[PDB]
Amino acid sequence: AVKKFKPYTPSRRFMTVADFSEITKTEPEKSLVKPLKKTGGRNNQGRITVRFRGGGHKRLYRIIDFKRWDKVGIPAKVAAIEYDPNRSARIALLHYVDGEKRYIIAPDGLQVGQQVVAGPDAPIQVGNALPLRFIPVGTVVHAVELEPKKGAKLARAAGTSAQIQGREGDYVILRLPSGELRKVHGECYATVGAVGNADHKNIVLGKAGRSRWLGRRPHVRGAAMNPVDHPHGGGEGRAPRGRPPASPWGWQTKGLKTRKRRKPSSRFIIARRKK
Amino acid sequence: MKRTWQPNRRKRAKTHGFRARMRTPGGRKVLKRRRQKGRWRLTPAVRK
RNA sequence: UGGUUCGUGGAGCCAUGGGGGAAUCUGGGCGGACCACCGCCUAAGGCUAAGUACUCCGGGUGACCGAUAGCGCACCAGUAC
RNA sequence: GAGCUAGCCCUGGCCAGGGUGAAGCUGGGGUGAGACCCAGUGGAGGCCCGAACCGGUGGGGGAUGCAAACCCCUCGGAUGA
RNA sequence: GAAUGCCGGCAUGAGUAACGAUAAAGAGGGUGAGAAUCCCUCUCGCCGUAAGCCCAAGGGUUCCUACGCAAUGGUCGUCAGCGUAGGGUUAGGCGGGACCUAAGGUGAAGCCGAAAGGCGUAGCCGAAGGGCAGCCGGUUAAUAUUCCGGCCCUUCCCGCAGGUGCGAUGGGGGGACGCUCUAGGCUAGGGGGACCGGAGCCAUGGACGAGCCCGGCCAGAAGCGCAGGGUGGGAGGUAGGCAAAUCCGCCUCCCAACAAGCUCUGCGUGGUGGGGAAGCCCGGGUGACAACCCCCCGAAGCCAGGGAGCCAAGAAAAGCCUCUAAGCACAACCUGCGGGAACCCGUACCGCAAACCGACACAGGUGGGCGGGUGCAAGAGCACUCAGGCGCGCGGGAGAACCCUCGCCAAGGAACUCUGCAAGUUGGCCCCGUAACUUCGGGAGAAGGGGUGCUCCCUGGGGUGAUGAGCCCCGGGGAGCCGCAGUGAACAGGCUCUGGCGACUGUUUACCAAAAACACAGCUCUCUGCGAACUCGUAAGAGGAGGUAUAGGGAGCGACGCUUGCCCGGUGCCGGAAGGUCAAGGGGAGGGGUGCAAGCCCCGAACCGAAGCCCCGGUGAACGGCGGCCGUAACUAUAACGGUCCUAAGGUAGCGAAAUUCCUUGUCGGGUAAGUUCCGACCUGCACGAAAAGCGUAACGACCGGAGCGCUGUCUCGGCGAGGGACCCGGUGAAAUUGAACUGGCCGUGAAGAUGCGGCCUACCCGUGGCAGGACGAAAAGACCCCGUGGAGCUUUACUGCAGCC
RNA sequence: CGAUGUCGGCUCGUCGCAUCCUGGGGCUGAAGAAGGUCCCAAGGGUUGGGCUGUUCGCCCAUUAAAGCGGCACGCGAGCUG
RNA sequence: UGGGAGAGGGUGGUGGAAUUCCCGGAGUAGCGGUGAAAUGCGCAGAUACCGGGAGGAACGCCGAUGGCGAAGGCAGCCACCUGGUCCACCCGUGACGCUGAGGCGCGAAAGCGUGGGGAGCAAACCGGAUUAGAUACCCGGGUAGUCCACGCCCUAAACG
RNA sequence: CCGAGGGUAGGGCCCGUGACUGGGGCGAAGUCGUAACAAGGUAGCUGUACCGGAAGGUGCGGCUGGAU
Ligand SMILES: [Mg+2]
Ligand SMILES: [Mg+2]
Ligand SMILES: [Mg+2]
Ligand SMILES: [Mg+2]
Ligand SMILES: [Mg+2]
Ligand SMILES: [Mg+2]
Ligand SMILES: [Mg+2]
Ligand SMILES: [Mg+2]
Ligand SMILES: [Mg+2]
Ligand SMILES: [Mg+2]
Ligand SMILES: [Mg+2]
Ligand SMILES: [Mg+2]
Ligand SMILES: [Mg+2]
Ligand SMILES: [Mg+2]
Ligand SMILES: [Mg+2]
Ligand SMILES: [Mg+2]
Ligand SMILES: [Mg+2]
Ligand SMILES: [Mg+2]
Ligand SMILES: [Mg+2]
Ligand SMILES: [Mg+2]
Ligand SMILES: [Mg+2]
Ligand SMILES: [Mg+2]
Ligand SMILES: [Mg+2]
Ligand SMILES: [Mg+2]
Ligand SMILES: [Mg+2]
Ligand SMILES: [Mg+2]
Ligand SMILES: [Mg+2]
Ligand SMILES: [Mg+2]
Ligand SMILES: [Mg+2]
Ligand SMILES: [Mg+2]
Ligand SMILES: [Mg+2]
Ligand SMILES: [Mg+2]
Ligand SMILES: [Mg+2]
Ligand SMILES: [Mg+2]
Ligand SMILES: [Mg+2]
Ligand SMILES: [Mg+2]
Ligand SMILES: [Mg+2]
Ligand SMILES: [Mg+2]
Ligand SMILES: [Mg+2]
Ligand SMILES: [Mg+2]
Ligand SMILES: [Mg+2]
Ligand SMILES: [Mg+2]
Ligand SMILES: [Mg+2]
Ligand SMILES: [Mg+2]
Ligand SMILES: [Mg+2]
Ligand SMILES: [Mg+2]
Ligand SMILES: [Mg+2]
Ligand SMILES: [Mg+2]
Ligand SMILES: [Mg+2]
Ligand SMILES: [Mg+2]
Ligand SMILES: [Mg+2]
Ligand SMILES: [Mg+2]
Ligand SMILES: [Mg+2]
Ligand SMILES: [Mg+2]
Ligand SMILES: [Mg+2]
Ligand SMILES: [Mg+2]
Ligand SMILES: [Mg+2]
Ligand SMILES: [Mg+2]
Ligand SMILES: [Mg+2]
Ligand SMILES: [Mg+2]
Ligand SMILES: [Mg+2]
Ligand SMILES: [Mg+2]
Ligand SMILES: [Mg+2]
Ligand SMILES: [Mg+2]
Ligand SMILES: [Mg+2]
Ligand SMILES: [Mg+2]
Ligand SMILES: [Mg+2]
Ligand SMILES: [Mg+2]
Ligand SMILES: [Mg+2]
Ligand SMILES: [Mg+2]
Ligand SMILES: [Mg+2]
Ligand SMILES: [Mg+2]
Ligand SMILES: [Mg+2]
Ligand SMILES: [Mg+2]
Ligand SMILES: [Mg+2]
Ligand SMILES: [Mg+2]
Ligand SMILES: [Mg+2]
Ligand SMILES: [Mg+2]
Ligand SMILES: [Mg+2]
Ligand SMILES: [Mg+2]
Ligand SMILES: [Mg+2]
Ligand SMILES: [Mg+2]
Ligand SMILES: [Mg+2]
Ligand SMILES: [Mg+2]
Ligand SMILES: [Mg+2]
Ligand SMILES: [Mg+2]
Ligand SMILES: [Mg+2]
Ligand SMILES: [Mg+2]
Ligand SMILES: [Mg+2]
Ligand SMILES: [Mg+2]
Ligand SMILES: [Mg+2]
Ligand SMILES: [Mg+2]
Ligand SMILES: [Mg+2]
Ligand SMILES: [Mg+2]
Ligand SMILES: [Mg+2]
Ligand SMILES: [Mg+2]
Ligand SMILES: [Mg+2]
Ligand SMILES: [Mg+2]
Ligand SMILES: [Mg+2]
Ligand SMILES: [Mg+2]
Ligand SMILES: [Mg+2]
Ligand SMILES: [Mg+2]
Ligand SMILES: [Mg+2]
Ligand SMILES: [Mg+2]
Ligand SMILES: [Mg+2]
Ligand SMILES: [Mg+2]
Ligand SMILES: [Mg+2]
Ligand SMILES: [Mg+2]
Ligand SMILES: [Mg+2]
Ligand SMILES: [Mg+2]
Ligand SMILES: [Mg+2]
Ligand SMILES: [Mg+2]
Ligand SMILES: [Mg+2]
Ligand SMILES: [Mg+2]
Ligand SMILES: [Mg+2]
Ligand SMILES: [Mg+2]
Ligand SMILES: [Mg+2]
Ligand SMILES: [Mg+2]
Ligand SMILES: [Mg+2]
Ligand SMILES: [Mg+2]
Ligand SMILES: [Mg+2]
Ligand SMILES: [Mg+2]
Ligand SMILES: [Mg+2]
Ligand SMILES: [Mg+2]
Ligand SMILES: [Mg+2]
Ligand SMILES: [Mg+2]
Ligand SMILES: [Mg+2]
Ligand SMILES: [Mg+2]
Ligand SMILES: [Mg+2]
Ligand SMILES: [Mg+2]
Ligand SMILES: [Mg+2]
Ligand SMILES: [Mg+2]
Ligand SMILES: [Mg+2]
Ligand SMILES: [Mg+2]
Ligand SMILES: [Mg+2]
Ligand SMILES: [Mg+2]
Ligand SMILES: [Mg+2]
Ligand SMILES: [Mg+2]
Ligand SMILES: [Mg+2]
Ligand SMILES: [Mg+2]
Ligand SMILES: [Mg+2]
Ligand SMILES: [Mg+2]
Ligand SMILES: [Mg+2]
Ligand SMILES: [Mg+2]
Ligand SMILES: [Mg+2]
Ligand SMILES: [Mg+2]
Ligand SMILES: [Mg+2]
Ligand SMILES: [Mg+2]
Ligand SMILES: [Mg+2]
Ligand SMILES: [Mg+2]
Ligand SMILES: [Mg+2]
Ligand SMILES: [Mg+2]
Ligand SMILES: [Mg+2]
Ligand SMILES: [Mg+2]
Ligand SMILES: [Mg+2]
Ligand SMILES: [Mg+2]
Ligand SMILES: [Mg+2]
Ligand SMILES: [Mg+2]
Ligand SMILES: [Mg+2]
Ligand SMILES: [Mg+2]
Ligand SMILES: [Mg+2]
Ligand SMILES: [Mg+2]
Ligand SMILES: [Mg+2]
Ligand SMILES: [Mg+2]
Ligand SMILES: [Mg+2]
Ligand SMILES: [Mg+2]
Ligand SMILES: [Mg+2]
Ligand SMILES: [Mg+2]
Ligand SMILES: [Mg+2]
Ligand SMILES: [Mg+2]
Ligand SMILES: [Mg+2]
Ligand SMILES: [Mg+2]
Ligand SMILES: [Mg+2]
Ligand SMILES: [Mg+2]
Ligand SMILES: [Mg+2]
Ligand SMILES: [Mg+2]
Ligand SMILES: [Mg+2]
Ligand SMILES: [Mg+2]
Ligand SMILES: [Mg+2]
Ligand SMILES: [Mg+2]
Ligand SMILES: [Mg+2]
Ligand SMILES: [Mg+2]
Ligand SMILES: [Mg+2]
Ligand SMILES: [Mg+2]
Ligand SMILES: [Mg+2]
Ligand SMILES: [Mg+2]
Ligand SMILES: [Mg+2]
Ligand SMILES: [Mg+2]
Ligand SMILES: [Mg+2]
Ligand SMILES: [Mg+2]
Ligand SMILES: [Mg+2]
Ligand SMILES: [Mg+2]
Ligand SMILES: [Mg+2]
Ligand SMILES: [Mg+2]
Ligand SMILES: [Mg+2]
Ligand SMILES: [Mg+2]
Ligand SMILES: [Mg+2]
Ligand SMILES: [Mg+2]
Ligand SMILES: [Mg+2]
Ligand SMILES: [Mg+2]
Ligand SMILES: [Mg+2]
Ligand SMILES: [Mg+2]
Ligand SMILES: [Mg+2]
Ligand SMILES: [Mg+2]
Ligand SMILES: [Mg+2]
Ligand SMILES: [Mg+2]
Ligand SMILES: [Mg+2]
Ligand SMILES: [Mg+2]
Ligand SMILES: [Mg+2]
Ligand SMILES: [Mg+2]
Ligand SMILES: [Mg+2]
Ligand SMILES: [Mg+2]
Ligand SMILES: [Mg+2]
Ligand SMILES: [Mg+2]
Ligand SMILES: [Mg+2]
Ligand SMILES: [Mg+2]
Ligand SMILES: [Mg+2]
Ligand SMILES: [Mg+2]
Ligand SMILES: [Mg+2]
Ligand SMILES: [Mg+2]
Ligand SMILES: [Mg+2]
Ligand SMILES: [Mg+2]
Ligand SMILES: [Mg+2]
Ligand SMILES: [Mg+2]
Ligand SMILES: [Mg+2]
Ligand SMILES: [Mg+2]
Ligand SMILES: [Mg+2]
Ligand SMILES: [Mg+2]
Ligand SMILES: [Mg+2]
Ligand SMILES: [Mg+2]
Ligand SMILES: [Mg+2]
């Protein structure tokens, strides 16, 4: 449930914050954090290559286990569920009976105290990871590897999930969170369940300052600029676009598809996204 | 008001210093020229 | 594509980024598309004095200057600033 | 050339005093249970007033200046983008 | 002889402006050739969250002393941050290095690029972050945590003794972290004392007093005490912590658990060592054998790595502890003691400024710490004042105009003016009281009003004590006293009504614009399946993101409410294995050059041959667009209705003389005595209209209109007063500008606006204070305008090309 | 065009006279009072306010009257802006 | 205390028929639609036929002049949770009752907010017809909505 | 002290009036259509919603107070 505020300042009138209800441990695991090196949107040449970044809260990176096939057959206890600033999902602390500790992204319904496992024989239950080929068609699934042993790449965002639709040869067919229909190899791991924190999308930032805390610096309209700067720049008074709406670099930005044409994975995409 | 010169010894050595000039083709050519010109100081005087 | 006087021209020659791809003198390249004839020359390895260029340096000489000239500097100047 | 200025990055520092009184929590009431109401407690906020500090609203002065942008009065922000 | 030429010299303006904050001076004494300006004394004023003190930058001898005054100093100079010389900076414990790492930089491996070079996990460098051992006092002209004195401490080497499986760059723990709020106990600092110590004082009407005035501490090992911080112990199992591990992790069991224990720090005490006032004598002596005590206030500092709450979720690495590995176990390491050893650089002085950044001894700019007392509710605000520091490096007179800054003003009260611009008014605190509207927070300090000093008497609660006294905090009730006046000085909102725009706090054109502009939460379209799209880069490599469609890019719109209509013919984008066109290349009917020939060489039709384009469809919060004429209704007027041309379709809701309305001050209504503005309406909207969004909207605004009350020198309409200038005398002494000048008025004339020409008129020679009509006054080779086959920024369905993409 | 600052206002005037008022006069379709119309006359006078940047103009309240023009559409080294 | 019938209510699962779209196959000149047509779709291969898949919605036969509920209403099947009601026994309580201004709850559909979901249907809207005209009826399209969760709205020929 | 009332300021309720505007009643000698009454020529009515010169239409659900 998202948390509202009474309108005791102009901004609190709309601000909503997450409830943090699932959260049970308020400090990360010391040996599982490392500093996040903040970039500001600058590459190694020092140049802004992604605009409007910088200035957010300091963050420690929590190391996440996006492999999991790494420790087949060894079970673990879900020790805690925690906040992670580097992602929308919460993360779950796993105590393996081995004694190793790792983090995973926390699926909807993971209970602290429960046990999870990975491998071809794992029970089809929330929290477990198996190759896709051993997961019943119809099951909703998250953190999916896109190619075997390359790490979880799909459905990691708060609330997201993928569903297994069918099988074909060495591949299963997934419905991605976008609704794309795609073949993913049978040997790729996925974890049963959807990602938690599904209310994430209902948060209302509420004020300029909150975007600022997120490291998101103000974004300025091409329309508010000059011709040296942008296709929409200039004109006396306000102006309509005056040409097909364009990015600062001139490419058209309402409809122009941009996926590379001859791309090898086209062969594995069955149906481009919906809506 | 605050003007443009705000001396900083470290800044001065790290920017115009002999080692900085030597690191780069442009700086080495600055030294080539200033030697050819007969400059008494090839590099800004700075105290350390 | 460049080089040549040659700017696509009738455009050869020399060179070569791409593709194809030989032969050993009865071999090959050239004489301005091409062909014949008649000649010239030996590619795909390397070196080679001298005669040539310059003047930081030394000397000699001016129908060259003579301290606003002549070098930016005749003087502690690439200095003071 | 970023010792000015602009943005970002790493690491530190600063923000008198006063006011308002969110959520929560406790208690009382209420009900089938509730919602909810009251009190106390609490101490939220690009909240309020106002120094430092950061500004530069209106006016006057200055105008071969004290100053190649200053001075006086006034005024904006002042836990936050 | 001219180039607003170039370099230099010297004039003019001119003994003119100015001499750099309006904090301020006066006198006596000294010194010296010379004194407002240097020294000393007394008096006066100014700063005192500083204009005092300590650090860091930067500066670089400016420090101290002697001897000097040409120049430097806005005057003077005997003085000085100036000239000459001589002296002066002392560290194992402060800071940095021989320690750690951050961003970043560099960079074995490796990757990339015509060259130069660009990258790059490790490593290395890199600090104002981590880590690490010194406090108090004394001494010099000038250094002192550095020398001295006292009491403490660190590492390294060697040794002795006791202990122990010792050993590391490898494993682990730890180091180790936010913001707001905050407890207990301390300390810093401060106030009081009838107590303690002290030179002395009794004035001028009174006082020999519980009088006045001054001071009443600092540092300190172990031990002890108080207050906090950190931390469970034992056993068994073990497959994880890229070897090993008894360590750490994980499971189980036993004992302990808001305790204790162990440990670390703060504070108190503590052997000892220091300091020690006023005043009085000449920095020093005395005071003094100084006293060195009690109470109160009390941190933002300390215990600390404390506590709670919150979301935006808050460095690393070494030191250090532990584990084991090669090894080694006569070693090694730990603990205690002893002896020896302990390097390099900085240290003067300025440091909110006359020594730093501003060309200047420049009213500007410059990070951190300390920053006393009283009173005003609080405070770092305000006034005064301590310590300490200053009177700002020209002065002396005078008492015009005018200017600046300031004070008052009869009657009036916005009549001023573009405008209440400016200045008044209001003003803190306590209490009463407070509207529309509202998103229920607010609007609100709405508005408006009362109180406010001192004296006496009665009385309530809290802190510290002890439960009491004293001290400190928060009050209540009663009776009075004085003045024009009690936040008696200083600091401290004028208010209301009503529209436009923008939701809001924010941001901006450094130096003419702070806004209605930008941003903003939020809404929508669109791209993107991840070696993402996208951006930078020739590339490698990076950003995106150690993210993954609840995400990332781009675009418009801009809280919120109610909404967002019709047109897809053109352009864009999307989709469309047909068809048309379509390059290289394929193909080779047919043809040609040459040769006696085989042959060599050239042209070449059909036909096959991509993207793109054409073509077919979709698509508007994609670019965009959203009509005209004729007729018709019981009088006129109009036209619900009919007809007709045109178009891709003809503007919906809502709004409308508007931030848009030309005609225009439209018309009507409101407000005013009067209203080109303002508000409300109407609708023939020159030329609104739905995300270049439409219409509204509480709250907000140094935004822009209109009105009212309050109050005023804004004004009728001006007067007086103050100080700083202006003026006069001494000192120092610019500037732009300047063809030369012996430089009047009129009417004419003249290249059309004459001191300079004609005619007349007027006029003795030369200044000083003032005014600005002229010298087409000065400044700036007009910025508007045009011209130049001049330049540059920007645009596109101009031309041509290139990157990029297909 | 190697610069002649440009509307309005304020301030300060000064001049013309085709006179707004005041003084003198002729004609009158001048009984009187009050007008009209022309002539002479420039000595002096010629108000305060609402609107608007306005000049102009309209309006309110008065007046003997509420004149029109010139002076670089007088006057920015005099101010405003 | 024994028993009973029932689409009474809530949750979670879950089955087959059909429609639509996509994929594969096979096939060709029309299909569709009306009173008749036209728009529309179709040689860029539609309709009709076979196989595969996706997704939402409603549950045919049983079915009734049936049943359940206070009403609004409720219908494939399964389980769990849960209300009402009837019967028999004549065992317990001992008038503990009726109605009920206010209040509280529930309340078809449409509609509204936030988020899902979207096959068929379908306001608005485009187009074809009909017609004197035809902002309609009929035809081809088509967005909200119809569906789910949660919160609102609180109407009705909410009727016997 | 209290005190008629006066003055200042802010509120509440009611009456009158107002550019302009919304519908309503009526009149009737008009224009436009023909929604309801018959199966009223699309059964009607209905709550709601969107829409149209106008009666009205359509969607969803409901009622019969529906002809055959
Ligand atoms: Mg809220
Ligand atoms: Mg709430
Ligand atoms: Mg508010
Ligand atoms: Mg608000
Ligand atoms: Mg949670
Ligand atoms: Mg949750
Ligand atoms: Mg943390
Ligand atoms: Mg670590
Ligand atoms: Mg990282
Ligand atoms: Mg780098
Ligand atoms: Mg970008
Ligand atoms: Mg950026
Ligand atoms: Mg999270
Ligand atoms: Mg969240
Ligand atoms: Mg949101
Ligand atoms: Mg953040
Ligand atoms: Mg954004
Ligand atoms: Mg923007
Ligand atoms: Mg703009
Ligand atoms: Mg602009
Ligand atoms: Mg640029
Ligand atoms: Mg451009
Ligand atoms: Mg452009
Ligand atoms: Mg444009
Ligand atoms: Mg334009
Ligand atoms: Mg523009
Ligand atoms: Mg314009
Ligand atoms: Mg425009
Ligand atoms: Mg613009
Ligand atoms: Mg435009
Ligand atoms: Mg546009
Ligand atoms: Mg356009
Ligand atoms: Mg792939
Ligand atoms: Mg600086
Ligand atoms: Mg430095
Ligand atoms: Mg430095
Ligand atoms: Mg530096
Ligand atoms: Mg250097
Ligand atoms: Mg030398
Ligand atoms: Mg150099
Ligand atoms: Mg030719
Ligand atoms: Mg050639
Ligand atoms: Mg080649
Ligand atoms: Mg041959
Ligand atoms: Mg050859
Ligand atoms: Mg030859
Ligand atoms: Mg030859
Ligand atoms: Mg030779
Ligand atoms: Mg040679
Ligand atoms: Mg000679
Ligand atoms: Mg000379
Ligand atoms: Mg020489
Ligand atoms: Mg020279
Ligand atoms: Mg010379
Ligand atoms: Mg020299
Ligand atoms: Mg030099
Ligand atoms: Mg920091
Ligand atoms: Mg603050
Ligand atoms: Mg709240
Ligand atoms: Mg709480
Ligand atoms: Mg605030
Ligand atoms: Mg505030
Ligand atoms: Mg102040
Ligand atoms: Mg100002
Ligand atoms: Mg002012
Ligand atoms: Mg001025
Ligand atoms: Mg200036
Ligand atoms: Mg000031
Ligand atoms: Mg102020
Ligand atoms: Mg603010
Ligand atoms: Mg403030
Ligand atoms: Mg504040
Ligand atoms: Mg703020
Ligand atoms: Mg000449
Ligand atoms: Mg000149
Ligand atoms: Mg000159
Ligand atoms: Mg010259
Ligand atoms: Mg010259
Ligand atoms: Mg003069
Ligand atoms: Mg002068
Ligand atoms: Mg001066
Ligand atoms: Mg003053
Ligand atoms: Mg003197
Ligand atoms: Mg003298
Ligand atoms: Mg003296
Ligand atoms: Mg210097
Ligand atoms: Mg010294
Ligand atoms: Mg001198
Ligand atoms: Mg002298
Ligand atoms: Mg001098
Ligand atoms: Mg002098
Ligand atoms: Mg000076
Ligand atoms: Mg002397
Ligand atoms: Mg000096
Ligand atoms: Mg020492
Ligand atoms: Mg050493
Ligand atoms: Mg290092
Ligand atoms: Mg350090
Ligand atoms: Mg010590
Ligand atoms: Mg010394
Ligand atoms: Mg950490
Ligand atoms: Mg830190
Ligand atoms: Mg005190
Ligand atoms: Mg003390
Ligand atoms: Mg083990
Ligand atoms: Mg003493
Ligand atoms: Mg003694
Ligand atoms: Mg803590
Ligand atoms: Mg690191
Ligand atoms: Mg040991
Ligand atoms: Mg050494
Ligand atoms: Mg040294
Ligand atoms: Mg020193
Ligand atoms: Mg000094
Ligand atoms: Mg200052
Ligand atoms: Mg300071
Ligand atoms: Mg100087
Ligand atoms: Mg001075
Ligand atoms: Mg200064
Ligand atoms: Mg006060
Ligand atoms: Mg106060
Ligand atoms: Mg003075
Ligand atoms: Mg005088
Ligand atoms: Mg007066
Ligand atoms: Mg008044
Ligand atoms: Mg008045
Ligand atoms: Mg005004
Ligand atoms: Mg005041
Ligand atoms: Mg009101
Ligand atoms: Mg309210
Ligand atoms: Mg008040
Ligand atoms: Mg008194
Ligand atoms: Mg004062
Ligand atoms: Mg105030
Ligand atoms: Mg108001
Ligand atoms: Mg307006
Ligand atoms: Mg604003
Ligand atoms: Mg704005
Ligand atoms: Mg708004
Ligand atoms: Mg907004
Ligand atoms: Mg804003
Ligand atoms: Mg500017
Ligand atoms: Mg500006
Ligand atoms: Mg500028
Ligand atoms: Mg300015
Ligand atoms: Mg501005
Ligand atoms: Mg502003
Ligand atoms: Mg802006
Ligand atoms: Mg904006
Ligand atoms: Mg919006
Ligand atoms: Mg890379
Ligand atoms: Mg990354
Ligand atoms: Mg991402
Ligand atoms: Mg904006
Ligand atoms: Mg509203
Ligand atoms: Mg179109
Ligand atoms: Mg189109
Ligand atoms: Mg176009
Ligand atoms: Mg042939
Ligand atoms: Mg168009
Ligand atoms: Mg458009
Ligand atoms: Mg008629
Ligand atoms: Mg329409
Ligand atoms: Mg209008
Ligand atoms: Mg009007
Ligand atoms: Mg309007
Ligand atoms: Mg318009
Ligand atoms: Mg108009
Ligand atoms: Mg007009
Ligand atoms: Mg008029
Ligand atoms: Mg106006
Ligand atoms: Mg106006
Ligand atoms: Mg009209
Ligand atoms: Mg735009
Ligand atoms: Mg607009
Ligand atoms: Mg504002
Ligand atoms: Mg403003
Ligand atoms: Mg005056
Ligand atoms: Mg006076
Ligand atoms: Mg005076
Ligand atoms: Mg005076
Ligand atoms: Mg005299
Ligand atoms: Mg002469
Ligand atoms: Mg002339
Ligand atoms: Mg003349
Ligand atoms: Mg003359
Ligand atoms: Mg003459
Ligand atoms: Mg005359
Ligand atoms: Mg003059
Ligand atoms: Mg003249
Ligand atoms: Mg003149
Ligand atoms: Mg020139
Ligand atoms: Mg010119
Ligand atoms: Mg020109
Ligand atoms: Mg022109
Ligand atoms: Mg031309
Ligand atoms: Mg020409
Ligand atoms: Mg040209
Ligand atoms: Mg150009
Ligand atoms: Mg692209
Ligand atoms: Mg001109
Ligand atoms: Mg000029
Ligand atoms: Mg002139
Ligand atoms: Mg008569
Ligand atoms: Mg006259
Ligand atoms: Mg006269
Ligand atoms: Mg006017
Ligand atoms: Mg007018
Ligand atoms: Mg008269
Ligand atoms: Mg004029
Ligand atoms: Mg003028
Ligand atoms: Mg002027
Ligand atoms: Mg003027
Ligand atoms: Mg002038
Ligand atoms: Mg003048
Ligand atoms: Mg002039
Ligand atoms: Mg004047
Ligand atoms: Mg065919
Ligand atoms: Mg019985
Ligand atoms: Mg009942
Ligand atoms: Mg309902
Ligand atoms: Mg419904
Ligand atoms: Mg509905
Ligand atoms: Mg019924
Ligand atoms: Mg009376
Ligand atoms: Mg009908
Ligand atoms: Mg009918
Ligand atoms: Mg009918
Ligand atoms: Mg019509
Ligand atoms: Mg319809
Ligand atoms: Mg019913």
Q: What resolution in angstroms, rounded to 1 decimal?
A: 2.8
Helix (H), strand (E) at residue B36 = helix B25-37
Strand E nucleotides, any atom under 7 Å to a protein CB:
57-60, 103-105, 116-117, 119-120, 172-174, 176, 238-241, 249-251, 310-316, 356-358, 364-366, 439-441, 503-505, 517-522, 525-537, 541-544, 546-560, 572-575, 618, 622-624, 692-693, 698-699, 793-797, 805-806
Strand D nucleotides, any atom under 7 Å to a protein CB:
1-5, 7-11, 22-23, 44-47, 69-70, 80-81
Q: How far apart, in whole angstroms, are the C-alpha atoms of residue A200 and residue A108?
A: 12
Could you give the strand order of the β-sheet that contains A76-82, starting from the edge strand earlier in sequence? Answer: A101-105, A91-96, A76-82, A115-116
Provide the experimental method for this PDB entry. X-ray
What is chain A's alpha carbon radius of gyration, rounded to the nearest angstrom?
A: 22
Q: How far apart, in whole angstroms, are the C-alpha atoms of residue A54 and residue B11?
A: 26
In this structure, is the CB of residue B38 within 7 Å of any atom belonging to strand C?
A: yes
**How many C-beta atoms lie closer than 10 Å to residue A47's C-beta?**
8
Q: How far apart, in whole angstroms, are the C-alpha atoms of residue A204 and residue A18?
A: 10
Q: Which residues surround ligand 40, an ion (CB under 5 A)?
A: B 43
Q: How far apart, in whole angstroms, are the C-alpha atoms of residue A223 and residue A229?
A: 10
Long-range contacts of range A45-51, CB-CB < 8 Å, 24 or more positions apart? A51/A219
Q: Which 106-135 residues of chain A approach strand E with CB closer than 7 Å?
A: none
Q: How far apart, in whole angstroms, are the C-alpha atoms of residue A194 and residue A154?
A: 11
HEC string of chain A? CCEECCCCCCCCCCCEECCCCCCCCCCCCHHHEEECCCCCCECCCCCECCCCECCCCCCEEECCCCCCHHHCCCCEEEEEEECCCCCCCCEEEEEECCCCEEEEECECCCCECEEECECCCCCCCCCCEEEHHHCCCCCEEECEECCCCCCEEECCCCCCCEEEEEEECCEEEEECCCCCEEEEECCCEEEECCECCHHHHHCCCCCHHHHHHCCECCCCCHHHCCCCCCCCCCCCCCCCCCCCCECCCCCECCCCCCCCCCCHHHHHEEECCCC
Q: How far is the CA of A236 from the centre of ligand 158 (A)?
A: 20
Q: How far apart, in whole angstroms, are the C-alpha atoms of residue A95 and residue A100?
A: 6
Q: Across the strands, what pairs with A34? A: A61
Q: Across the strands, what pairs with A168? A: A171
